[PDB]
Amino acid sequence: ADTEKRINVGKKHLQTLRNLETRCHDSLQALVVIDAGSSSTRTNVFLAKTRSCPNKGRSIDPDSIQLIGAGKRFAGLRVVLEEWLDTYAGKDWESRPVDARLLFQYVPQMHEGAKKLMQLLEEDTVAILDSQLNEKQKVQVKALGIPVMLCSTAGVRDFHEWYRDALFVLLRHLINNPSPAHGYKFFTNPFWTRPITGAEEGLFAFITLNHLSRRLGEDPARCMIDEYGVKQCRNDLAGVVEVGGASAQIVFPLQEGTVLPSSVRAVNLQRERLLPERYPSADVVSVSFMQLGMASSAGLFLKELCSNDEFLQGGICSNPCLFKGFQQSCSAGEVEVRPDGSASVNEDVRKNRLKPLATYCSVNNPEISFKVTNEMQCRENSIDPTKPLAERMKIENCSIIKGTGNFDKCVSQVESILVAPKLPLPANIEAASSGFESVDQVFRFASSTAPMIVTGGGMLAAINTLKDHRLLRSDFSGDVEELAEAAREFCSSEVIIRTDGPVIQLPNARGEQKLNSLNFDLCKTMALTVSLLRHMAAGENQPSFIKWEKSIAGPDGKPLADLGWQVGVILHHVLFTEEWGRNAYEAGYSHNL
Amino acid sequence: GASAQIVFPLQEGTVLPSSVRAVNLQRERLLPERYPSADVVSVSFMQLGMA
Ligand SMILES: Nc1ncnc2c1ncn2[C@@H]1O[C@H](COP(=O)(O)O)[C@@H](O)[C@H]1O
């Protein structure tokens, strides 16, 4: 009588079915972050595990977030508006005054320009999904809808009329109207698709760093009892130094028991709605330096160095940050190292590395008339706001720039021009910003023992180049003198012209590498790094360690996602359970019909 | 005698330059949330006091 066996099969069958209707169900979801930078617009495709629980709705497991594809670098959002202003306002718009009111006639023409770009991003996104997902995964991803987060960093923020915000209204209309033939349910809203500031970018990069490295989590790393008797809990978070194209961000946890001066403030991630209340309280020093971006620092450096009598003689600017044998036209225009060995300087106003700073330093537009010191800071850098744009960016009494390959002079000038200028640029007081004005002020008044991660392609190139030539050891841990001695050797290299093109030839027959558009001025980045490390060493509190990272390894050893602001943007929406459930699932793609 | 203060309601729908900021009385915990929102321009100059 194996009747008992077949009774239990029936009992277990019913239990299996009961468990299935009472337990949580997992489903895969795709998430898209469109990185709309200054000179490019690129799609970023993510996957996440959603959990659907009886009477609780649907949520994302934040630890499941993973990048499955980075797309093609298309034209920057700036290009859409520049071309629209070239056709309808006249190619003369960058110099001549334009009545913005008249441009409302060309709204569907602006819509068409943005449509071209959005179709290309949509095409590229669909391509990445189709190539990375199996048929089962595609069924889950197509049914759930695909939230889209388009965020413009730099480039677009520089227009100062109605165009910018109107463009955003148009991009969202295009995102919410995808072609039905592919079946991917792309959608957005004004909370997910919007421009972000340099300061907000830093906070997102801080969140990304801390999530990927698993330092950020609901469970506190350490708790402490305050003066009143209430338990105060925190995570052991790492700080971040992110050097981008248009700005550099420095975001790190506020030192425990530190009281900042009244004029500056710790940015509280819970108060700013970047982290939910269920996460340990996070108070950070947040700083975004507009003159410390790869592009903006290059422009300002030339403007200031080449207006200094020690460096400028008879129309020749002797640049200590450029290699011996290198020469270029005297301007902050975009440099192309030609196979010939020579340098081509793009003289277009649109391609000038000083353009963001020179538009910021004008009589016609901002803070210049407001605070006397603001106009005083522009004139100091030989950019008088009363002059037209071309004249403001022009390096006067200067014809050529010759490299002298003197690292110590390069460090001294980076210190004097970019890191500790006599008159800092106005302090930014937005919610995302602590309100600091210089690097010294940060490390003099608000230094911390939290570890620091150095990020940005240019920063990592500076270190890796020295390691590649065996000037820096692979175990390099951030010692200043070690870096300075390594860079002093590399930076004294000669530009040699060979049949295969120009080369950076190292002293004492150490070797060579090809000279190119990306590496010709990298000694300025090595000098910036030396200067940052010195200011960090001079702090009362020292970071427990300093590391240079491009990626953070995951549980399997493979990076789950890349460093930057993208992960942080997903998290600040996704971690707010109720609001995310309402927007992504209740409203969803069905909100578009 | 020691300083002069100027405090007045911020004009509705006005764009403050990114170097200055309006003071919200509710955010500063000076007025409860049940009172209408109060955004103000707030200055105190020691050099304008009578002494
Ligand atoms: N290998 C590199 N050498 C020099 N500059 C770079 C390199 N990779 C990226 N950059 C620049 O560094 C900045 C940040 O780059 P990324 O971290 O790749 O967004 C940008 O201005 C890039 O053009």
Curated annotation (Swiss-Prot), chain A:
GO terms for cellular component: membrane; symbiont-containing vacuole. Keywords: Glycoprotein, Hydrolase, Secreted, Signal. GO terms for molecular function: nucleoside diphosphate phosphatase activity; ribonucleoside triphosphate phosphatase activity. InterPro entries: GDA1_CD39_NTPase, NTPase_alveloata. The keyword Flavoprotein does not apply. The keyword Secreted applies. It is an enzyme of class 3 (hydrolase). The active site is at residue 201. Pfam families: GDA1_CD39 (PF01150). Homotetramer. May perform an important processing step in the conversion of high energy nucleotides prior to uptake by the parasite and may contribute to intracellular survival and virulence. NTPAse-I has a specific activity 4.5-fold higher than NTPAse-II in hydrolysis of ATP. The primary difference between these isozymes lies in their ability to hydrolyze nucleoside triphosphate versus diphosphate substrates. While NTPAse-II hydrolyzes ATP to ADP and ADP to AMP at almost the same rate, NTPAse-I hydrolyzes ADP to AMP at a much slower rate (0.7% of the rate for ATP). Belongs to the GDA1/CD39 NTPase family. This is Nucleoside-triphosphatase 1.
